[PDB]
Design a protein around this nucleic acid. Structure first.
Length: 4
DNA sequence: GCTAGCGAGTCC
DNA sequence: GGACTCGCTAGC
């Protein structure tokens, strides 16, 4: 997963 | 924690 | 293109  | 699997992202 | 990186899921 690719988020802050 | 180990071993196994999925899919978007990184370095050469 | 390939080995590698990383978040999440799964069985044990």
């Amino acid at each position: 997963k690719w988020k802050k």
